[PDB]
Design a binder for this molecule. Sequence first.
Ligand SMILES: O=C(O)C1=Cc2ccccc2OC1
Lengths: 237, 300
Amino acid sequence: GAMNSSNYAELFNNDIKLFVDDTNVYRVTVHKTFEGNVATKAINGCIFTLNPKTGHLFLKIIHTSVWAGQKRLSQLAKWKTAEEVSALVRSLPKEEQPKQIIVTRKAMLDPLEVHMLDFPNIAIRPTELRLPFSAAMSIDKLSDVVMKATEPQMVLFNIYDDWLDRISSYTAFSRLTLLLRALKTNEESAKMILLSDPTITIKSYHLWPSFTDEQWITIESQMRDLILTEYGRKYNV
Amino acid sequence: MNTVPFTSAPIEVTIGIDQYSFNVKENQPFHGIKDIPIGHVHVIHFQHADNSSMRYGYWFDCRMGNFYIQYDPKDGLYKMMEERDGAKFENIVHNFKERQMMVSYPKIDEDDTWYNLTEFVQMDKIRKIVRKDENQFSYVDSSMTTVQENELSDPAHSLNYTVINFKSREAIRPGHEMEDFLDKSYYLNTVMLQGIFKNSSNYFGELQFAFLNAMFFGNYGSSLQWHAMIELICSSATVPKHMLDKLDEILYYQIKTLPEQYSDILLNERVWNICLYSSFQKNSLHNTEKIMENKYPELL
Ligand SMILES: O=C(O)C1=Cc2ccccc2OC1
């Protein structure tokens, strides 16, 4: 079935599961041609595949060369996403392979199910959760490695840094979704909240700043405030 | 002209023979159906007046033997039986007709409908789908499930239709995932026509049989199979030209014959919109398109 919030804690039980977001796979810049027309140029993209319990992010970088000479690219991108997710699953030891893959966009269901035919016991599901993984490229270090790639490349990250030393997976996912929702809503202001104090640094091997427990509380309330402020501006409340 | 005698008609019933139907009252002096244009195939079916649950019936070839109907008050249904003693059967059939006790198979000469519907339907293939080797005729009813349904619970009572599953290894070559899902030509031509059905006539025969089982019995798994075998052709970019042209004629007569008030339950909106308006073969079903629009515009 589909996921949501009746069974939102199940995301953090001990059946391995992966979220797959494909919204940054095919990425273009839209510009105007010499004859007046409008033309696209592709830039590198990525598949966002996340274990919500562990924080392990499998960031498969999609190099623009994969689109060369192909047609119907937005359709092809779903199939390319499915091909790489299946390849990732096949490269993992059996005891590490997911029992469920949850796609953030329902258009991915058929492509992934067809590429996953060898794994009949792996459930492929959509979700009714609105997740902000499209904003993954607002995380500077993820954007940098995608834009610098000259060839297809897989990069592994822990998107929770060291948070699980101190909080639960449920709390870390909620912090992550809050952060990304704020970056999706008002990116420049969200980045300012995070970087406002230069004495709080990002460790070389982390994505986010090394906040203390009390600072994360303050940061989380500023992100809530940001999202709520933008809601009011949008709907004149 | 063959004859189907009925021992008695103890319960009020609607009797179908091929595409026709008539009513019989409880304990009405009804002894059968005469003047049946011999075929290659035929179907006699029943729906009891006091319980229209379970429609059931029997596919049969008059040339394979002499068949009659005898009501069984224990199982509570009209059962088909075979009479191996030809002389006895002649004796009953050359007499009860003489009495005036049966009704005539009412074929109009201009009417080639039943054979346009059953052109590729054969009894030997029917008996492979409905497995009951000791009988030369084949029982089907409203409730029977297909082997495919059973895999998603009594195999003896199953409809052994050819399993068609678009999201299965049989349909999708490794390495050709997108290609074969978007263009089912491999699955149609290599797997189904060359591998399993051998020729397009057998393919069309199962399609016709499935349609008729859905229409006459309201058998849901049969309707699924009918729509799947249509969709497989329409979703293939490469289909032999003789198949395409014949498909338009097959479907046209099926749509032509469908009860007008049964369209909400025998037609799958998704499959038909895809085949007529979106698929590779949209422009190959001209007459089916024309009848479906003029007859069922509400589905599309
Ligand atoms: O031997 C037979 O085949 C029959 C016997 C019989 C008797 C009276 C009416 C119908 C019958 O059906 C046929």
